[PDB]
């Protein structure tokens, strides 16, 4: 039992709080998963951030109970000569029998960065047992 | 059933088109997979690129039908002081019942870059159902 | 369909010329009753950084009781980075349990004397299957 959602682009976003990346959503309930474990992979292979103060993006895996895992990339220069593509992957294993109905990908600005996904990205899950 | 192929190095390559990374090939047919879903992970943990115009590498997951997912890393300087190692992971979920016999890893130059893998890299797949 | 996972929210700062264990990134394959088959292992360190004076970086490894099965690194592209940016890292290996594997662990080693930092979420995961 394999869940997968993929996008080829997202709207540009700037946010001080975690907001949902449109299209990176897995309905666990719709697949009739009510117990057990999901290994979740948020894969954003070609993201970039724009800004004037060491830009970056915070990414999270979230369920109906909140954020379960988060991370980020940041550039190593204040004003990068060019905002290079910086691959990002996040892996978390969640318990469904806690009352999980959904899994989603979120993002949040680092230091006011504008966040960009303009190519393929994916949210995936494999089901198993404790 | 768990598919896996790993390499410890590849030849240096420059290409304006996607070409196959030698050794990163999964034979779905030989494994007797003709239906269902594969979650594929292309993992190139220690790549780098060389060039004079903001180097990088494009990576793709491809089947007998073509590319199903792609991404890249790029540096953030035109002529990096040193071409740092830039980890890359791509994840895609494919339908084997569409006529898939193989899954392979490909790469393509960014702006004429020379592409380097000189350490471990892997192409993996887990089979499941919808 | 057993799913193994270990996660941390931080580790101690480390400088090491040799691979050392990242505390908390450990999977007991035996205790889970796995004695045969294949594990697909993912080491995920999404927000690491390194500090140093000479193009800093970190080497990461997946290891078993038999030794290292896979390794990689990130490195910065400047000798003395203006700031040590967070550089996401993932390593994927598929191992055989029936060779005498009891455990899987995450390791790290300095690049050029770097100090190694994990101060946020990181994970070691495994999915069991067969050839
Ligand atoms: C923000 C810039 O984005 C550039 N990339 C593009 O503008 C671009 C244009 C067309 C296609 C793609 C692309 C294609 C396949 C997969 C991902 C991206 C990138 C990239 O090369 C630079 O280093 C920099 O990060
Ligand atoms: C291109 C350069 O490559 C260097 N890497 C090596 O020269 C090197 C030499 C021996 C072994 C390895 C290695 C070992 C394990 C896994 C990956 C690479 C790297 C690296 O330190 C620099 O920052 C830079 O990106
Ligand atoms: C070493 C620096 O680390 C900074 N990050 C932090 O200091 C920081 C502070 C509080 C929280 C977090 C964090 C939160 C969620 C996930 C990961 C990290 C980072 C980062 O923005 C910079 O670019 C740089 O790499």
UniProtKB/TrEMBL annotation, chains A, B:
It comes from the Bacteria. GO terms for molecular function: identical protein binding. Residues 12-126 form the Bc2l-C N-terminal domain. This is Lectin. The lineage of its organism: Bacteria, Pseudomonadati, Pseudomonadota, Betaproteobacteria, Burkholderiales. The chain holds residues 2 to 131 of 272 of the full protein.
Automatic annotation (TrEMBL), chain C:
Signal peptide: none annotated. Residues 13-127 form the Bc2l-C N-terminal domain. Transmembrane segments: none annotated. This is Lectin. It comes from Burkholderia cenocepacia (strain ATCC BAA-245 / DSM 16553 / LMG 16656 / NCTC 13227 / J2315 / CF5610).
